[PDB]
């Protein structure tokens, strides 16, 4: 443990977080990776089990694993369960790549409780108009909604974010994001 250090999984929250998640995996494929989630949906014939998803045969068993606290974030969509498991985050991180995560803010303590202490970054907009600045592809109704949801997220989870990132542009946001990971890399 003194010589080799596991790569800390990464949870970026807030406006443009998916654009940051896309960009980081693109810019450094050997440093950042994605983890395979489980679903109870049946696979299409071009989806590859164990690589695109882990396809769960017994849907009854997935909720047994969910109640055994085997997932950090679970969910349903179109009648099918979805979820990132703890073992799927450990597999990326043990390759020493930072695992890029689409989890809610609630998954931070469960990763911590599982000792996979993530870098939790909150992108914080400074106004409605500021959301319009760092995301020039949303309508005001989407911006106002983006701004309120951000406000509630900081109120409830401000204490679990390793860094809060601000800027007048995604370029500025994305720079500071990359540097937080540098200063918390290890």
């Amino acid at each position: 443990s003194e010589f080799v250090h596991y790569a800390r999984p990464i949870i970026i929250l807030g406006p443009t977080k998916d654009r940051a998640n896309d960009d980081l995996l693109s810019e450094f494929p050997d440093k950042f990776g994605s983890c395979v989630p489980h679903t109870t949906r049946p696979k299409r014939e071009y989806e590859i089990d164990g690589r695109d998803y882990h396809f769960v045969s017994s849907r009854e068993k997935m909720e047994k694993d969910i109640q055994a606290h085997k997932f950090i974030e679970a969910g349903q969509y179109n009648s099918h369960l979805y979820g990132t498991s703890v073992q799927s985050v450990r597999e990326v991180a043990e390759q020493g790549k930072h695992c890029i995560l689409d989890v809610s803010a609630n998954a931070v303590r469960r990763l911590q409780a599982a000792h996979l202490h993530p870098i939790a970054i909150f992108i914080r907009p400074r106004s409605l108009e500021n959301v319009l600045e760092i995301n020039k592809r949303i309508t005001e109704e989407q911006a106002r909604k983006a701004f309120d949801r951000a406000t509630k997220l900081e109120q409830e989870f401000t204490e679990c974010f390793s860094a809060i990132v601000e800027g007048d542009s995604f370029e500025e946001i994305y720079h500071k994001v990359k540097r937080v990971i540098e200063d918390l890399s290890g």
Binding site: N21, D22, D52, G75, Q76, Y77, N78, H80, S104
Partner: peptide, 12 residues
């Protein structure tokens, strides 16, 4: 991530 929009969609 782009092959798992249904997952991403489920989490919200």
């Amino acid at each position: 991530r782009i092959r798992r929009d249904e997952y991403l969609k489920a989490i919200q």
